[PDB]
Amino acid sequence: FVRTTAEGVARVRKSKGKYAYLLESTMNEYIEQRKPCDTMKVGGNLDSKG
Amino acid sequence: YGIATPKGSSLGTPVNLAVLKLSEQGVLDKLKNKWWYDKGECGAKDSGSK
Amino acid sequence: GMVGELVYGKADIAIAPLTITLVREEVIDFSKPFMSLGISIMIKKPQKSK
Amino acid sequence: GMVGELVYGKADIAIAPLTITLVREEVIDFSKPFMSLGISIMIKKPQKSK
C-alpha cells in the first residue's frame, strides 16, 4: 500500500513492470495520456460506480 | 439500468437508498456474477483449454 | 409496457433492465444505476484453424 | 469538503468528480452519473523487446 495516489503511480514507473496499482478508471485513463506515456489501462473495470 | 417508481410514491426514496446499499455491500456484483458466469453454460473455457 | 403500468397505477414499482433515459425520467422516478453498460462489439471466436 | 459546503449552505451546487455513495446520498441529492468508472489495473507496458 502507498500513502497517496501520487506515490502509487511513481512506484509502477520504477518497478520495471514488476508492480501493479489498482485505482479508478477515470484517473487511470488520464495517466495513460500524460508523459512519459509509461502507463496503460489493462482489462475492464471491477465494480460499477459513477 | 434502473428501478422505476411513480412520482411522489412513498417507495421512491427508500428504494433508491436500498440500491446503493446493495452496490457497496457487493450484492449487485455478486448477483451479476451469478446469472452470467456461474450459471452460464460457457464451453469455451473448457474447449479452448485442452 | 412497464413504464405505462406505473403512471397509470396498474403497478407500484418496476424492477427490470430498463434503460435510464431522459424521456422516462420526466414521468417516472428512476433509482441509481445498478448495472452500468454500453454499446460493445460481438464477433465469432476465430479458430484459425487457417 | 464539497459535500460539507452543501449541507452547511456555503455552496448551492457541487460540480466535481464526486463518488456517488450511499453515505452521501442520505445528506445530498445526487444527479444521474455523468461518467461511469470502476477499479482498473495500471502497469508499465514493456518496452522490453530489446
Side-chain angles (χ1 to χ4, degrees), chain B residues 19-33:
Chain B
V19 175
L20 295 177
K21 186 184 301 178
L22 301 178
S23 185
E24 301 181 9
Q25 289 182 359
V27 184
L28 294 183
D29 295 335
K30 194 176 182 180
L31 297 178
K32 173 64 179 300
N33 189 263

Side-chain angles (χ1 to χ4, degrees), chain C residues 1 3-7 9 12 25 27 37 42 49:
Chain C
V3 186
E5 297 185 6
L6 293 182
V7 187
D12 296 330
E25 185 77 312
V27 292
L37 63 80
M42 175 195 298
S49 294

Side-chain angles (χ1 to χ4, degrees), chain A residues 23-44:
Chain A
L23 75 166
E24 49 269 8
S25 67
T26 59
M27 190 61 58
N28 188 15
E29 290 176 359
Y30 176 68
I31 303 302
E32 183 180 353
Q33 312 298 329
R34 290 295 183 178
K35 291 184 178 181
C37 323
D38 45 21
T39 59
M40 171 181 297
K41 173 184 179 299
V42 287

